[PDB]
Tab-separated table of C-alpha atoms and ligand atoms in Angstrom:
chain	number	residue	atom	x	y	z
A	1	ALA	CA	98.770	77.887	105.652
A	2	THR	CA	97.809	80.125	102.792
A	3	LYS	CA	95.694	83.101	103.905
A	4	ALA	CA	93.591	85.796	102.154
A	5	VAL	CA	91.404	88.689	103.201
A	6	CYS	CA	88.628	90.783	101.664
A	7	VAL	CA	87.262	94.162	102.768
A	8	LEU	CA	83.663	94.545	101.506
A	9	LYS	CA	82.333	98.074	100.995
A	10	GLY	CA	79.087	99.414	99.670
A	11	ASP	CA	76.376	101.983	100.264
A	12	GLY	CA	74.650	101.846	103.697
A	13	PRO	CA	77.237	101.656	104.779
A	14	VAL	CA	77.631	97.952	104.181
A	15	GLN	CA	80.944	96.976	105.634
A	16	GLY	CA	82.530	93.563	105.988
A	17	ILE	CA	85.809	91.756	106.662
A	18	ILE	CA	86.093	88.213	105.378
A	19	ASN	CA	89.031	85.919	106.115
A	20	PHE	CA	90.193	82.865	104.196
A	21	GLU	CA	92.551	80.107	105.378
A	22	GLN	CA	93.707	76.978	103.507
A	23	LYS	CA	96.191	74.752	105.401
A	24	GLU	CA	97.036	72.659	102.344
A	25	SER	CA	96.548	73.312	98.675
A	26	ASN	CA	94.592	70.036	98.302
A	27	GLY	CA	92.414	70.996	101.303
A	28	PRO	CA	89.300	73.065	101.931
A	29	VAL	CA	89.182	76.816	102.514
A	30	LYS	CA	87.738	78.150	105.824
A	31	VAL	CA	85.898	81.421	105.206
A	32	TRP	CA	84.916	83.640	108.174
A	33	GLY	CA	84.116	87.186	109.281
A	34	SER	CA	81.276	89.626	109.712
A	35	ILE	CA	79.211	91.803	107.411
A	36	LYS	CA	77.142	94.677	108.839
A	37	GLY	CA	74.564	97.096	107.378
A	38	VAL	CA	72.357	94.679	105.424
A	39	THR	CA	68.676	93.806	105.704
A	40	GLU	CA	67.501	90.859	107.865
A	41	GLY	CA	67.441	87.633	105.908
A	42	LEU	CA	69.486	85.845	103.309
A	43	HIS	CA	71.953	87.551	100.949
A	44	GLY	CA	73.721	85.815	98.087
A	45	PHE	CA	77.473	85.511	98.561
A	46	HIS	CA	79.779	84.719	95.709
A	47	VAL	CA	83.201	85.042	94.199
A	48	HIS	CA	82.966	86.887	90.869
A	49	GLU	CA	85.318	86.496	87.967
A	50	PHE	CA	87.283	89.795	87.861
A	51	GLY	CA	89.003	91.758	90.594
A	52	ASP	CA	87.981	94.950	88.808
A	53	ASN	CA	86.065	97.537	90.801
A	54	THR	CA	86.805	100.420	88.432
A	55	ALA	CA	83.077	101.283	87.995
A	56	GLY	CA	81.973	99.596	91.230
A	57	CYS	CA	80.887	96.030	91.899
A	58	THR	CA	79.353	95.741	88.402
A	59	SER	CA	82.912	95.664	86.973
A	60	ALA	CA	83.531	92.278	88.662
A	61	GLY	CA	81.506	90.513	85.987
A	62	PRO	CA	79.738	87.147	86.421
A	63	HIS	CA	80.233	84.434	89.029
A	64	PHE	CA	83.741	82.877	88.891
A	65	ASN	CA	83.061	79.850	86.666
A	66	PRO	CA	86.297	78.374	85.350
A	67	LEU	CA	84.623	74.932	84.619
A	68	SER	CA	81.719	76.393	82.650
A	69	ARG	CA	78.984	74.922	84.853
A	70	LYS	CA	75.535	76.169	85.877
A	71	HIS	CA	74.795	77.997	89.118
A	72	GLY	CA	74.117	76.110	92.361
A	73	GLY	CA	74.511	76.005	96.073
A	74	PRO	CA	77.850	75.269	97.737
A	75	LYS	CA	76.614	71.663	98.392
A	76	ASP	CA	75.786	70.952	94.701
A	77	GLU	CA	78.153	69.139	92.270
A	78	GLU	CA	76.663	71.355	89.572
A	79	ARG	CA	77.866	74.769	90.828
A	80	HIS	CA	80.116	77.622	89.802
A	81	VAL	CA	83.457	77.613	91.672
A	82	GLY	CA	82.383	81.016	93.098
A	83	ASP	CA	79.096	79.805	94.551
A	84	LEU	CA	79.258	80.275	98.284
A	85	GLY	CA	75.487	80.236	98.954
A	86	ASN	CA	73.982	82.833	101.351
A	87	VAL	CA	75.033	84.768	104.375
A	88	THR	CA	72.136	85.343	106.804
A	89	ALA	CA	71.803	88.649	108.703
A	90	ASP	CA	69.754	89.238	111.885
A	91	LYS	CA	67.546	92.289	112.809
A	92	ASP	CA	70.686	94.205	113.855
A	93	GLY	CA	71.779	93.960	110.163
A	94	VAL	CA	74.771	91.749	110.977
A	95	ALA	CA	75.715	88.532	109.143
A	96	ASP	CA	78.288	86.391	110.864
A	97	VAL	CA	80.077	84.230	108.301
A	98	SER	CA	81.445	80.758	108.965
A	99	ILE	CA	81.788	78.633	105.847
A	100	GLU	CA	84.056	75.746	104.895
A	101	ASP	CA	84.381	75.152	101.149
A	102	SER	CA	86.054	72.366	99.206
A	103	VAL	CA	85.795	73.855	95.676
A	104	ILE	CA	87.353	77.328	96.011
A	105	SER	CA	91.085	77.440	96.528
A	106	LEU	CA	93.802	79.924	97.426
A	107	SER	CA	96.160	78.429	94.739
A	108	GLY	CA	95.937	76.483	91.423
A	109	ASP	CA	93.286	76.835	88.741
A	110	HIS	CA	90.388	77.436	91.183
A	111	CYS	CA	92.297	80.242	92.882
A	112	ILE	CA	90.128	83.165	94.060
A	113	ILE	CA	92.944	85.549	94.989
A	114	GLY	CA	92.633	88.749	92.944
A	115	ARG	CA	88.920	88.156	92.196
A	116	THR	CA	85.928	89.984	93.776
A	117	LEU	CA	83.767	88.770	96.679
A	118	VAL	CA	80.197	90.165	96.391
A	119	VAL	CA	77.276	90.252	98.852
A	120	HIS	CA	73.869	90.637	97.163
A	121	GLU	CA	70.545	92.416	97.715
A	122	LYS	CA	68.459	89.246	97.919
A	123	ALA	CA	68.625	85.554	98.627
A	124	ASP	CA	70.400	83.131	96.337
A	125	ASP	CA	67.894	80.365	95.560
A	126	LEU	CA	70.876	78.004	95.110
A	127	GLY	CA	69.688	77.244	91.596
A	128	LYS	CA	66.473	75.602	92.968
A	129	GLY	CA	64.330	78.598	91.963
A	130	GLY	CA	61.705	78.590	89.191
A	131	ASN	CA	63.352	80.297	86.168
A	132	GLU	CA	66.534	80.254	84.004
A	133	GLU	CA	67.973	83.143	85.967
A	134	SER	CA	68.151	80.744	88.904
A	135	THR	CA	70.757	78.708	86.935
A	136	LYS	CA	72.954	81.792	86.220
A	137	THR	CA	72.706	84.142	89.257
A	138	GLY	CA	70.321	82.384	91.632
A	139	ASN	CA	68.163	85.518	91.522
A	140	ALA	CA	70.183	87.288	94.178
A	141	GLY	CA	69.649	90.719	92.698
A	142	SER	CA	71.807	93.776	92.988
A	143	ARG	CA	75.355	93.988	94.478
A	144	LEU	CA	75.291	95.650	97.883
A	145	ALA	CA	79.003	95.505	98.713
A	146	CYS	CA	82.204	93.955	97.229
A	147	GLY	CA	86.005	93.996	97.479
A	148	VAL	CA	89.004	92.338	95.870
A	149	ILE	CA	90.373	89.207	97.587
A	150	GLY	CA	94.018	89.773	98.620
A	151	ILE	CA	96.873	87.653	99.963
A	152	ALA	CA	97.179	87.944	103.751
A	153	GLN	CA	100.018	87.444	106.159
B	1	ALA	CA	97.556	88.361	77.253
B	2	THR	CA	97.134	88.808	81.042
B	3	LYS	CA	95.519	91.932	82.500
B	4	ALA	CA	95.106	93.405	86.022
B	5	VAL	CA	93.716	96.582	87.477
B	6	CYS	CA	93.926	98.562	90.737
B	7	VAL	CA	91.614	101.203	92.173
B	8	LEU	CA	93.580	103.451	94.554
B	9	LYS	CA	91.759	105.174	97.433
B	10	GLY	CA	92.822	106.673	100.769
B	11	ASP	CA	91.516	108.670	103.802
B	12	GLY	CA	92.081	111.875	101.841
B	13	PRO	CA	91.338	113.077	98.315
B	14	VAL	CA	93.856	110.797	96.542
B	15	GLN	CA	92.247	108.632	93.854
B	16	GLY	CA	93.716	106.632	90.982
B	17	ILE	CA	93.124	103.848	88.478
B	18	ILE	CA	96.125	101.816	87.324
B	19	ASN	CA	96.039	99.247	84.565
B	20	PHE	CA	98.474	96.341	84.013
B	21	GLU	CA	99.073	94.292	80.882
B	22	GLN	CA	101.457	91.401	80.159
B	23	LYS	CA	101.407	89.898	76.637
B	24	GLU	CA	103.684	86.972	77.466
B	25	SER	CA	104.488	84.961	80.529
B	26	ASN	CA	107.828	86.308	81.731
B	27	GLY	CA	107.530	89.281	79.272
B	28	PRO	CA	107.369	92.902	80.432
B	29	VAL	CA	104.352	94.353	82.211
B	30	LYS	CA	102.951	97.688	80.986
B	31	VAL	CA	101.606	99.783	83.822
B	32	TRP	CA	99.440	102.829	83.067
B	33	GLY	CA	96.760	105.139	84.350
B	34	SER	CA	96.189	108.313	86.357
B	35	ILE	CA	96.303	109.464	89.966
B	36	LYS	CA	94.690	112.694	91.146
B	37	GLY	CA	94.711	114.704	94.363
B	38	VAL	CA	98.407	114.651	95.183
B	39	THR	CA	100.949	117.398	95.643
B	40	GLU	CA	103.145	118.510	92.737
B	41	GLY	CA	106.350	116.430	92.656
B	42	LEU	CA	107.518	112.863	93.006
B	43	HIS	CA	105.516	110.230	94.933
B	44	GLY	CA	106.816	106.749	95.823
B	45	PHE	CA	104.939	104.023	93.930
B	46	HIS	CA	105.298	100.375	94.963
B	47	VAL	CA	103.743	96.969	95.191
B	48	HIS	CA	103.474	95.928	98.818
B	49	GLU	CA	103.464	92.355	100.089
B	50	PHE	CA	99.896	91.865	101.248
B	51	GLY	CA	96.539	92.587	99.637
B	52	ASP	CA	95.185	93.344	103.111
B	53	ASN	CA	93.314	96.605	103.574
B	54	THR	CA	91.616	95.645	106.904
B	55	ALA	CA	92.968	98.698	108.773
B	56	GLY	CA	93.712	100.681	105.588
B	57	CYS	CA	96.963	100.924	103.590
B	58	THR	CA	99.090	100.177	106.644
B	59	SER	CA	97.840	96.517	106.551
B	60	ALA	CA	99.639	95.990	103.215
B	61	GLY	CA	102.931	95.530	105.076
B	62	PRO	CA	106.355	96.071	103.535
B	63	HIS	CA	107.464	96.290	99.894
B	64	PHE	CA	106.897	93.055	98.023
B	65	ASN	CA	110.317	91.402	98.256
B	66	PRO	CA	110.281	87.634	97.591
B	67	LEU	CA	114.027	87.642	96.699
B	68	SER	CA	115.107	89.313	99.979
B	69	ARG	CA	116.857	92.232	98.291
B	70	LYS	CA	117.454	95.758	99.403
B	71	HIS	CA	115.300	98.628	98.244
B	72	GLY	CA	116.124	100.359	94.938
B	73	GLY	CA	114.759	101.947	91.774
B	74	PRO	CA	113.103	100.031	88.995
B	75	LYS	CA	116.240	100.414	86.842
B	76	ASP	CA	118.501	98.855	89.516
B	77	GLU	CA	119.497	95.191	89.765
B	78	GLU	CA	119.335	95.513	93.533
B	79	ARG	CA	115.626	96.278	94.031
B	80	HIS	CA	112.583	94.794	95.641
B	81	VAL	CA	110.179	93.122	93.158
B	82	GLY	CA	107.654	95.833	94.152
B	83	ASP	CA	109.899	98.779	93.455
B	84	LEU	CA	108.236	100.869	90.690
B	85	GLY	CA	110.017	104.108	91.504
B	86	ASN	CA	108.046	107.380	91.513
B	87	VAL	CA	105.033	108.844	89.747
B	88	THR	CA	105.321	112.584	89.137
B	89	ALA	CA	102.359	114.975	89.645
B	90	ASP	CA	101.883	118.364	87.977
B	91	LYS	CA	100.523	121.594	89.460
B	92	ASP	CA	96.984	120.269	88.877
B	93	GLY	CA	97.876	117.455	91.336
B	94	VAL	CA	97.556	114.812	88.646
B	95	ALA	CA	100.139	112.128	87.946
B	96	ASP	CA	99.965	110.344	84.624
B	97	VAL	CA	101.551	106.925	84.833
B	98	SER	CA	103.131	105.058	81.954
B	99	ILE	CA	105.675	102.461	83.089
B	100	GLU	CA	107.096	99.281	81.611
B	101	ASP	CA	108.633	96.826	84.090
B	102	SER	CA	110.257	93.348	83.538
B	103	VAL	CA	110.618	92.412	87.237
B	104	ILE	CA	106.960	92.425	88.241
B	105	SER	CA	104.756	89.803	86.678
B	106	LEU	CA	101.134	88.870	86.399
B	107	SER	CA	101.952	85.140	86.758
B	108	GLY	CA	104.501	82.896	88.530
B	109	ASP	CA	106.530	83.593	91.693
B	110	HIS	CA	106.912	87.347	91.004
B	111	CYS	CA	103.121	87.649	90.626
B	112	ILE	CA	101.584	90.870	91.929
B	113	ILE	CA	97.941	89.876	91.632
B	114	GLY	CA	96.290	90.038	95.073
B	115	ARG	CA	98.936	92.358	96.492
B	116	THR	CA	98.530	96.133	97.167
B	117	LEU	CA	99.721	99.045	95.077
B	118	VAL	CA	100.549	102.138	97.168
B	119	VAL	CA	101.193	105.756	96.290
B	120	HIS	CA	103.235	107.663	98.950
B	121	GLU	CA	103.351	111.125	100.517
B	122	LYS	CA	106.921	111.929	99.418
B	123	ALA	CA	109.562	110.993	96.863
B	124	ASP	CA	111.259	107.564	96.756
B	125	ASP	CA	114.994	108.305	96.706
B	126	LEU	CA	115.515	105.037	94.790
B	127	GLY	CA	117.741	103.853	97.622
B	128	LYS	CA	120.474	106.463	96.904
B	129	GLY	CA	119.517	108.877	99.674
B	130	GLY	CA	122.375	107.696	101.870
B	131	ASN	CA	120.564	106.948	105.081
B	132	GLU	CA	119.554	103.442	106.131
B	133	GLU	CA	115.865	104.005	105.362
B	134	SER	CA	116.934	104.682	101.789
B	135	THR	CA	117.730	100.955	101.514
B	136	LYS	CA	114.388	99.720	102.986
B	137	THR	CA	111.477	102.123	102.107
B	138	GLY	CA	113.355	104.809	100.198
B	139	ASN	CA	112.036	107.536	102.528
B	140	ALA	CA	108.731	107.916	100.622
B	141	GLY	CA	106.792	108.383	103.908
B	142	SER	CA	103.123	107.902	104.605
B	143	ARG	CA	100.707	105.965	102.394
B	144	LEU	CA	98.264	108.277	100.634
B	145	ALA	CA	96.160	105.799	98.703
B	146	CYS	CA	96.223	102.106	97.864
B	147	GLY	CA	94.220	99.252	96.456
B	148	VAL	CA	94.394	95.517	95.868
B	149	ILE	CA	95.572	94.438	92.428
B	150	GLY	CA	92.850	92.404	90.714
B	151	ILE	CA	92.470	90.206	87.629
B	152	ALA	CA	90.935	92.143	84.753
B	153	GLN	CA	88.997	91.035	81.744
C	1	ZZT	C1	85.028	78.913	108.916
C	1	ZZT	O1	85.486	78.563	110.245
C	1	ZZT	C2	86.351	79.309	110.939
C	1	ZZT	C3	87.722	79.030	110.814
C	1	ZZT	C4	88.675	79.771	111.518
C	1	ZZT	C5	88.246	80.806	112.359
C	1	ZZT	C6	89.297	81.589	113.110
C	1	ZZT	C7	86.875	81.096	112.501
C	1	ZZT	C8	85.923	80.354	111.790
C	1	ZZT	N1	84.620	80.650	111.943
C	2	ZZT	C1	98.674	100.691	77.020
C	2	ZZT	O1	99.248	101.999	77.328
C	2	ZZT	C2	98.543	103.132	77.506
C	2	ZZT	C3	97.225	103.223	77.056
C	2	ZZT	C4	96.495	104.390	77.246
C	2	ZZT	C5	97.060	105.499	77.872
C	2	ZZT	C6	96.211	106.742	78.034
C	2	ZZT	C7	98.386	105.428	78.320
C	2	ZZT	C8	99.120	104.246	78.139
C	2	ZZT	N1	100.385	104.207	78.586
C	3	CU	CU1	77.418	87.319	93.250
C	4	CU	CU1	105.234	101.701	98.971
C	5	ZN	ZN1	76.921	81.101	90.498
C	6	ZN	ZN1	111.303	98.699	98.014
């Protein structure tokens, strides 16, 4: 298997460890881990284009979108490659993450290694919201924590 | 023209930003930036195998060494891919880095994107120190600061 890891850090503290595993390069990626320090409810969760955290999470740029599509949920055909939907945290501020995704990859042109994983202030409307912003960012608001996705042993 | 960046941080006061640029696939990579908060003198400077920072810089594992070579200096034929020698800090504790390397790459099987850059406590003896640890780690000692190498705009 190919494996990757991301350490998310932001003010709070928001702290997370997210694991990625892809048994075959034509197969889906299992994404799992825990994020603590966030508000109860949904928080947008995406892979962003650049693995640049020089000025913080803002340096990561837009959602990873190699196919030039509009924003969506992980279930939509019309989505960015980076669109991983929402993580949901409880009252204790903890979001337990267990995702399987068929569109991200840990090799080839959809590869997310060396790009930034970001957890957001607010819910991602999965592009089903009211406005145009829904179709770009899903109205998920500010970036609470991020880290660069690295190759793991 | 491929670009990458790394933000170095540790448990102490050691901070850096290092930029990478490769104009041509299989051309040389220009490595530049600044590191502050280190002692005056030489500090080992290497790409390590994993971009895993779960338990800090220790999680990065050994020097990146896909060709199974012994440790050396960047000017040696016998070197690890990750062997970038030393950065030298002044009395202000600041190390200005300007390197060109043709062994590292930002694409292909020598690719460093998603791996960890590490700045060390002590000098790298470039494998010529004449103990056995010269030929593995170069005796550069603890890891002062590190970060995952990310894709830049
Ligand atoms: C996303 O699913 C998973 C895959 C593998 C492991 C170890 C945990 C989870 N939740
Ligand atoms: C591209 O190379 C460089 C650019 C800017 C500075 C300050 C140093 C180097 N080496
Ligand atoms: Cu995002
Ligand atoms: Cu090292
Ligand atoms: Zn998106
Ligand atoms: Zn080495």
